[PDB]
Design a protein around this ligand. Structure first.
Ligand SMILES: CC(C)(CCCOCn1ccc(=O)[nH]c1=O)NS(=O)(=O)c1ccccc1
Ligand SMILES: CC(C)(CCCOCn1ccc(=O)[nH]c1=O)NS(=O)(=O)c1ccccc1
Ligand SMILES: CC(C)(CCCOCn1ccc(=O)[nH]c1=O)NS(=O)(=O)c1ccccc1
Ligand SMILES: [Mg+2]
Ligand SMILES: [Mg+2]
Ligand SMILES: [Mg+2]
Ligand SMILES: [Mg+2]
Ligand SMILES: [Mg+2]
Ligand SMILES: [Mg+2]
Lengths: 125, 125, 125
């Protein structure tokens, strides 16, 4: 039932959630990145996570980066069994480069509840 | 279990959902906006919402605006305890300006079920 | 319940999920498409789906197409009662054209659990 994580390097920061009813934990960059205009980057967090059973982890955008700096998050579907280093794919749609520094919050991680259905083909629904 | 909302000005339109089984309620703009090509705008609904317990409110794209006009929704994670004016971050990736008129539907609001886990750091998963 | 689907033409490919704990089933293009830089396309799968009760179907990005080729998915909210041809709205934000060949996996379908709340207006929350 808890979200567990481990730091893969000392550059990682433990994810935080200030409000008890916020949808997501903050994810912090482990490194500095410069993302030119209309360009993408995979920002490494250097953490691995073990999500609660019954959800996947969605890497979702922070609201202020989106509205103020035209930053979006691509990809974003972390499967329940993924134990690698969590990467945030950021898209910079703004006309200026966007700087990430180590320790900056750059996305949030949401435990999205889903079904894992078996699939069946039929002739017509 | 219901979704409650209040109008913050008389320009607001109550969200609607025509089908009992549609994923989202329609969100309507409270104002006119002109969003140039490759630009973004924060479109105010002038409503506040109180989402049902156990979900967050995802502001998600309308399907036709995306396929027909290349409009996408940025940000989009409204925490369950957010009581301010609901804003829709629209991105216009088309080659022509996109007009929003007051009263237009410009996104949909989905009650996405999530866990709110506690977090635990371990040395290694 | 299960996810049922039917092929609407012989060009469709049954969706697949390699891992038991992957969040989504891969969706396959039924046709070739060439998506120029900064353009979008509606890629038809020629399948119809019947999603389990209690979810909508989100068309979500494949992680590799996003990080390696700057491909994103627009629209993406398939209501639980939709019985038409599933279309994937791909956005190519890359500097080079992106080729979809028939039979290529171009998105994933996630059964995102949601509430279907009734709506109530109040004077102020
Ligand atoms: C094996 C792949 C496809 C996925 C590896 C990461 O899988 C987990 N995962 C999935 C989505 C995501 O956004 N972040 C993340 O950490 N490699 S990659 O294309 O280079 C890529 C790296 C980081 C983030 C997204 C994609
Ligand atoms: C305090 C902030 C970060 C968020 C205030 C709104 O938070 C609730 N919220 C969150 C996501 C969203 O898409 N819409 C919304 O109404 N301010 S802002 O950057 O200007 C911004 C306003 C509207 C939408 C997105 C961002
Ligand atoms: C009636 C419409 C609005 C929606 C018809 C498809 O509704 C189901 N649906 C919804 C979201 C989605 O991404 N794919 C999909 O198949 N027509 S359309 O704008 O041309 C469009 C077609 C395919 C995908 C997105 C949009
Ligand atoms: Mg170092
Ligand atoms: Mg700023
Ligand atoms: Mg997006
Ligand atoms: Mg139109
Ligand atoms: Mg969800
Ligand atoms: Mg490739």
């Amino acid at each position: 039932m808890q979200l567990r994580f481990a730091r893969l390097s000392e550059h990682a920061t433990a994810p935080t959630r200030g409000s008890a009813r916020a949808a997501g934990y903050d994810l912090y960059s482990a490194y500095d990145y410069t993302i030119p205009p209309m360009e993408k980057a995979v920002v490494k967090t250097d953490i691995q996570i073990a999500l609660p059973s019954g959800c996947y982890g969605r890497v979702a955008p922070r609201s202020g980066l989106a509205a103020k700096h035209f930053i979006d998050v691509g990809a974003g579907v972390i499967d329940e069994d993924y134990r690698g280093n969590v990467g945030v794919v950021l898209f910079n749609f703004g006309k200026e480069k966007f700087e990430v520094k180590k320790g900056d919050r750059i996305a949030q991680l949401i435990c999205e509840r889903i079904f894992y259905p078996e699939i069946e083909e039929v002739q017509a629904l």
